């Protein structure tokens with residue numbers, strides 16, 4: 001990829017870049033999944049052994065406060081601001097908020113809201129005054145890459161994201177193990193109840209939670225499952241990684257071309273009865289200038 | 304009926 005910005009890249013020290021990041025040592029892990037219920041079109045399989053070079057990854061998704069500092073320093077204008085609208089979940093649109101008639105096919109719970117963007121996540125009249133440490137949302141893949149570059153970082157590859165999110169467990173279902181609520185404790189912010197009609201908020205949240213909510217995984221990462229989808233560097237495909245080659249098994253970068261970029265981790269909207277996509281092997285995609293109220297990102301860096 | 308959708312794209316709403 002070859003982006004273009006209108007801000008210069010500031011000088012930063014290695015110690016500044018690494019703050020809030022964890023160092024993932026070089027090694028191998030088993031990537032992918034073989035859940036019999038996985039949707040074939042998602043390409044969760046095959047399970048494969050992947051070798052990665054050492055890397056750093058953020059413990060937390062990028063927060064509103066952090067994104068605000070980036071915008072302050074650079075004047076960056078997000079894709080949602082250029083387009084003038086972004087996607088908001090229907091239950092979060094205040095009555096009377098002007099909305100577009102647009103329909104996401106198959107997903108009528110998404111509303112295109114003029115003026116929804118990172119600082120007004122439910123549209124005109126909303127703000128982030130009470131959400132400084134929540135993940136920034138309504139950021140597109142372009143916005144994420146812009147922030148990461150300004151920060152001296154990059155987006156993780158899908159393999160880096162998954163190795164870090166798995167937190168040192170071999171082929172577990174979730175970042176922490178195989179049970180969704182071990183000991184009856186919620187471990188992530190997803191949907192409870194009847195999707196898309198009623199979210200009971202059993203886990204504490206019916207929208208985003210602070211980036212440090214719930215316990216971390218074994219490597220110290222928070223909210224890799226649930227909360228917000230997280231953009232990765234890779235172009236999406238369902239089958240590039242089915243090939244067995246150095247390109248797909250050693251520091252894999254994904255296909256060299258595509259139309260949508262990978263997103264990992266699930267969000268506060270995911271539920272077993274609909275998408276079941278909060279498992280750590282799960283994956284989907286979105287086009288790179290798209291933005292939504294349930295999608296953010298975390299950064300990685302070469303050491 | 305078709306694959307569940309978690310990522311809503313700007314392209315998806317363009318229709319005539």
Ligand SMILES: *C(O)c1ccccc1N
Nearest residue numbers: 273274275304305306307
């Ligand atoms: C259709 O196939 C469908 C619809 C809702 C939830 C799951 C699935 N598979």
Ligand SMILES: [Ca+2]
Nearest residue numbers: 189190203205
């Ligand atoms: Ca929740």
Ligand SMILES: [Ca+2]
Nearest residue numbers: 224226228265
């Ligand atoms: Ca997540």
Ligand SMILES: [Cl-]
Nearest residue numbers: 178179180181
């Ligand atoms: Cl379970």
Ligand SMILES: [Cl-]
Nearest residue numbers: 191192193194
């Ligand atoms: Cl439930």
Ligand SMILES: [Cu+]
Nearest residue numbers: 270275277309
């Ligand atoms: Cu989902």
